[PDB]
Paper text:
Recently, DarR, a 201 residue, TFR regulator of a putative MDR transporter, Ms5347, in Mycobacteria was discovered and represents the focus of this work. Structures of TFR proteins reveal that they share a two-domain architecture with an N-terminal DNA-binding domain and a C-terminal inducer binding/dimerization domain. The DarR N-terminal domain consists of helices 1-3 and the dimer domain is comprised of helices α4-α9.
The structure revealed clear density for cAMP molecules bound at each dimer interface, in the same location bound by c-di-AMP. Unlike c-di-AMP, the cAMP appears to be tightly bound to DarR; the B-factors (ave) for the cAMP is 33.5 Å2 compared to 22.6 Å2 for the protein and 36.0 Å2 for water molecules. Interestingly, in this structure the cAMP is rotated ~90 relative to the nucleotides in the c-di-AMP bound structure. Nonetheless, the contacts to the cAMP are provided by the same sets of residues that bind c-di-AMP. The Arg165 side chain contacts both the cAMP ribose and phosphate groups in the DarR-cAMP complex. The cAMP adenine N1 and N6 atoms are read by hydrogen bonds from Gln184 while the adenine N6 and N7 atoms are specified by the backbone carbonyl and amide nitrogen atoms of Arg179. Because cAMP interact with residues from both subunits of the DarR dimer, it would be predicted to function as a stabilizer of dimerization.
Residue numbers in the entry:
A (entry chain A), B (entry chain A): 6 to 110, 113 to 207
The structure:
């Protein structure tokens, strides 16, 4: 098996474990069990549980950006782009739920992080801010072009992003739910966020 | 000082401490420090940190219900009632943010809870479900009366509740912000959730 494929299975297992039990209670042994190996294989690829967390965060950010970024500068009104970006964001959340949990999962901790880990975390947090700024940019454009309501752009951006991510309060993966079924659920959610619940 | 007033100060301090540091890292000493007393005063009123958590949850549920319930059966369309209920919910979140954090804050824990504590927790969780069901009832009514869009009532309820609570991602209390200023911010948030961000 290619080493990149083994790493991917580790990240998949770790993302789901961190989601299920939380970072603090997840162990390297949990992750090893879920990929069919020993702790030694995990440590060969990642030196610590926090390094695995950082790698999950990095991969989650890459995946969501690759799904959403193509729409930001595409032809269309602000609303058309915002709908496409928002559906893609929610679809990514629904497909890669464990990665989403990590991306969105304290300064006061029991042990110090390594210097390298703190630098990597800060860079990932800035990447997440850069990603969220794409929504602010499109919302500002849509307010200006009239496809969105004349509301406060900062409040609308913070509200919309919190709402897209709040799908994680209730959504759980269902085995055998199809790609279109997940896309359709994401579309229904975004229809409520952009079109509202109130009539006319 | 009346004992009920001392208890209220303890709950206020604990709600803010649990918000700031989390339940696990908060200590009885933290709470004692914040009310100007010793751990002994805290233990006189509440036997354990989890008992304080339960009392915060209970008081948070009482406060939100008292603010929101009067609207559920009041005269008005489903949308009119939903707007009033939602503004009241968000205002309660903004005013009593630490209580809100507790109400919305694992089965696998390091120590067993007392029997009495597990019973109390289960009852509080059912009270929270009863509260959220008021929104489902009004959304169903508003779909039927045409004041809300013909959308799926279960999805709309889960989405709306997650969105009302997701204000906590970005909102922080500002000292000296007035009651009307907080009410107005809550109204702006609810305007986005009910009316949508998309134009016309
Ligand atoms: N993958 C999914 N597809 C469709 N509906 C879902 C999915 N995940 C969660 N839900 C809905 O969210 C609800 C949350 O509580 P329930 O498990 O009672 O029922 C759930 C479904 O109605
Ligand atoms: N109480 C509040 N009143 C008005 N705006 C707020 C309040 N709390 C948070 N915000 C907004 O939410 C933003 C979150 O990040 P900032 O602190 O950069 O700036 C904040 C404000 O724009």
């Amino acid at each position: 098996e290619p080493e990149s494929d083994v790493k991917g299975r580790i990240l998949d297992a770790a993302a789901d474990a961190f989601m299920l039990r939380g970072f603090a209670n997840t162990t390297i042994d949990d992750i090893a069990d879920d990929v069919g190996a020993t702790a030694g294989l995990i440590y060969y690829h990642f030196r610590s549980k926090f390094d695995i967390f950082l790698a999950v965060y990095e991969d989650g950010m890459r995946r969501v950006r690759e799904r959403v970024e193509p729409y930001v500068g595409a032809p269309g009104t602000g609303r058309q782009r915002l709908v496409a970006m928002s559906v893609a964001h929610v679809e990514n959340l629904m497909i890669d739920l464990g990665y989403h949990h990590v991306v969105h999962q304290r300064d006061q901790a029991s042990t110090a992080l390594k210097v390298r880990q703190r630098d990597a975390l800060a860079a990932l947090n800035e990447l997440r801010r850069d990603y969220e700024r794409m929504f602010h940019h499109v919302i500002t454009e849509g307010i200006a072009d009239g496809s969105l309501r004349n509301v406060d752009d900062a409040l609308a951006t913070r509200t919309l992003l919190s709402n897209l991510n709040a799908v994680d309060v209730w959504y759980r993966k269902i085995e055998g739910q199809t790609e279109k079924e997940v896309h359709d659920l994401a579309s229904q959610v975004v229809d409520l966020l952009i079109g509202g619940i109130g009539a006319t």
